[PDB]
Amino acid sequence: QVQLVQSGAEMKDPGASVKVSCRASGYKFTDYYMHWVRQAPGQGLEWVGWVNTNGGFTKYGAKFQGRVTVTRDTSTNTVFLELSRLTFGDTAMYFCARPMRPVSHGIDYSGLFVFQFWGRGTMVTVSSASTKGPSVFPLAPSGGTAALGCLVKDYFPEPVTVSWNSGALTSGVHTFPAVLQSSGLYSLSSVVTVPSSSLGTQTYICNVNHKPSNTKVDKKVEPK
Amino acid sequence: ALTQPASVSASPGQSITISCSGTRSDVGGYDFVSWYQQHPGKVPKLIIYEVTKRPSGIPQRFSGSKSGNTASLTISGLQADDEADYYCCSYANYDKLILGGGTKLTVLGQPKANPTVTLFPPSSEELQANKATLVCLISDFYPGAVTVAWKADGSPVKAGVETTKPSKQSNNKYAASSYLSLTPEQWKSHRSYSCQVTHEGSTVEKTVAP
């Protein structure tokens, strides 16, 4: 019967601000605090802060001091999370979560220190206002196997395709998901596991294509 | 803030235990440890609180304990649906909540496979552009989760690291990658850099130098 309903995903420029909403129902609103918990893509849960809905008192996590402001509207049972001066590091799912019991002020705070009911989360994506082509660097090789590859560094936006030897080479090829970096740019690598004995006689070339920047690169990857 | 293993696994019907190590300021100082289950792409779910208690609806085969600065979650009678990421959480001095980095629980489909690790040096092409990236490749492993720790001449490096979520290879084993950003001066000046990879059944540390 407890429900927490959050506003929709947001896309923002660096430096912008955003306000996420969380609508509570199925309990007496001011009897409970509300938490905000975030999760950057592929990362762990992080506590952002709490608000006492009775009165509005707030506390924030260490890395979230200042650029985060949590409020509520008791007349509409709504809790808000505002993020100002957005950075690429702020890209994350933001969840509101209700603790399990009212706090007894000056007596018992045990009720506060859990996330019992969760909203579905609101994605905030801080997106690079740019197009950059990648630099392509060889990953030089050297159980009878060896790995080699190409590092496709600092590009935006997605995607980048990578083939090997004009598509001829498939076995042992692995192309990773891109990593979002603090700069707002992506990097990825593509590797291939090959017989060690093929090094120095077989030729390995990665074919990289980043269409948004019209970057097409064929990089020969030679042993050290 | 709290330390958990990257992954744990076992067969259907068996049991696993997930550790959560902290300090006197948090896990060791209070009985305010909670655990959360997150099924892929779903909302986290409270499963344990106050070290040992369970909210309503969570079966008895989920249990929690603590000894000193380490809390543990134990799940017995493992089922396929238990496959999920698990996070521990604790109150900490002062007026904060801190969480572990998460643990992937795999209900084994196949026997475990040890990772093979390759550490690539910066290329001369990157170096001549006044930059340097070490690339740690982790290949052919199962269950699909690892911890990657970077070291400079034996000591920890936390700045300039990015790591991919494990991905699935064509041959259905798992791979991961990690990237350490350095200056060319750091690369040329240290005796060595290393990538240390911790997987469920083995640890591998690879070292590279100019």
Side-chain angles (χ1 to χ4, degrees):
Chain A
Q1 188 183 96
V2 168
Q3 288 178 271
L4 299 173
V5 177
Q6 304 192 214
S7 53
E10 283 281 11
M11 279 258 308
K12 293 287 175 178
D13 297 319
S17 70
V18 66
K19 197 146 161 183
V20 175
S21 310
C22 169
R23 170 72 65 81
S25 61
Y27 65 94
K28 181 170 186 178
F29 183 65
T30 55
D31 271 4
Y32 292 81
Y33 287 47
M34 188 73 83
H35 297 285
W36 288 96
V37 178
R38 81 172 200 169
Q39 190 171 36
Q43 308 310 301
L45 304 174
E46 296 181 85
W47 178 74
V48 170
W50 68 50
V51 59
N52 184 353
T53 62
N54 193 2
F57 196 84
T58 50
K59 294 261 94 158
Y60 304 103
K63 59 186 293 188
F64 301 107
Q65 286 302 142
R67 285 187 311 103
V68 167
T69 304
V70 174
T71 56
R72 66 156 174 43
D73 185 333
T74 59
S75 68
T76 71
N77 282 24
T78 304
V79 180
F80 303 96
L81 170 57
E82 174 177 28
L83 271 47
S84 52
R85 281 105 167 163
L86 284 169
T87 69
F88 292 112
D90 296 320
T91 294
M93 283 287 278
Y94 290 79
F95 300 98
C96 59
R98 199 207 73 175
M100 68 182 156
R101 292 192 306 280
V103 156
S104 181
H105 306 279
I107 298 180
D108 176 22
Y109 296 86
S110 57
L112 177 57
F113 304 138
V114 305
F115 315 119
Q116 182 187 9
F117 295 99
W118 294 66
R120 191 181 288 246
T122 295
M123 188 66 194
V124 175
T125 307
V126 183
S127 178
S128 179
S130 81
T131 298
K132 183 186 173 306
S135 298
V136 184
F137 303 117
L139 298 176
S142 269
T145 63
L148 59 95
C150 285
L151 174 68
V152 184
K153 197 178 133 197
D154 291 333
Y155 63 93
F156 191 89
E158 305 206 84
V160 162
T161 55
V162 184
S163 65
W164 286 89
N165 295 352
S166 301
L169 185 59
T170 61
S171 185
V173 177
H174 188 87
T175 299
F176 289 97
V179 291
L180 182 45
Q181 324 188 194
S182 63
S183 59
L185 303 173
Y186 296 101
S187 286
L188 79 71
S189 61
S190 176
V191 302
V192 42
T193 304
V194 295
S196 297
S197 58
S198 72
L199 301 182
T201 181
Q202 294 302 288
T203 296
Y204 299 99
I205 297 167
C206 68
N207 321 112
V208 180
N209 191 6
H210 182 241
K211 296 168 173 180
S213 64
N214 181 240
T215 298
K216 62 178 179 295
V217 170
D218 301 313
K219 182 61 65 170
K220 191 183 173 190
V221 174
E222 293 183 324
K224 284 134 89 168
Chain B
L2 300 168
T3 306
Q4 305 177 224
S7 86
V8 297
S9 67
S11 318
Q14 295 185 319
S15 71
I16 52 92
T17 303
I18 308 174
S19 62
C20 171
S21 301
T23 76
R24 202 48 48 164
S25 287
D26 40 82
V27 172
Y30 306 89
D31 288 330
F32 291 145
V33 178
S34 48
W35 293 84
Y36 302 83
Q37 171 191 70
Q38 192 180 26
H39 280 94
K42 301 308 183 40
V43 83
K45 182 192 284 190
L46 175 67
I47 61 176
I48 297 276
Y49 70 97
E50 282 165 34
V51 191
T52 62
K53 301 189 180 72
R54 282 170 287 117
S56 305
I58 308 298
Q60 286 179 334
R61 61 187 186 87
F62 292 77
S63 68
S65 62
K66 115 185 176 178
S67 176
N69 292 331
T70 301
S72 299
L73 170 70
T74 293
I75 305 173
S76 61
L78 263 194
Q79 312 169 8
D81 288 322
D82 298 337
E83 209 159 63
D85 296 323
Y86 292 79
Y87 295 88
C88 63
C89 173
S90 178
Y91 178 78
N93 297 334
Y94 308 85
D95 290 328
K96 65 195 194 190
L97 287 166
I98 60 170
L99 284 99
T103 298
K104 181 186 198 170
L105 199 181
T106 297
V107 176
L108 293 169
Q110 296 286 349
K112 300 186 188 176
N114 192 330
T116 168
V117 180
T118 307
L119 179 58
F120 295 106
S123 65
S124 65
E125 292 89 344
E126 195 184 16
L127 287 167
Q128 68 185 7
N130 277 324
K131 298 190 177 173
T133 306
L134 296 183
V135 182
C136 186
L137 164 67
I138 311 107
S139 307
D140 297 295
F141 63 87
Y142 182 82
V146 293
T147 298
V148 181
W150 288 92
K151 299 174 185 320
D153 278 336
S155 309
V157 183
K158 301 280 309 186
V161 177
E162 301 291 350
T163 304
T164 54
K165 292 297 285 282
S167 46
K168 191 159 166 283
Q169 295 171 172
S170 290
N171 66 7
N172 301 319
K173 288 294 166 281
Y174 287 77
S177 63
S178 184
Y179 313 93
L180 172 64
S181 300
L182 294 173
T183 67
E185 185 266 341
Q186 288 172 298
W187 171 240
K188 296 167 175 174
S189 74
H190 286 87
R191 175 162 299 277
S192 70
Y193 275 84
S194 62
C195 172
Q196 181 194 95
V197 176
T198 299
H199 183 252
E200 271 198 45
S202 92
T203 298
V204 179
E205 185 159 341
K206 285 285 169 172
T207 308
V208 73

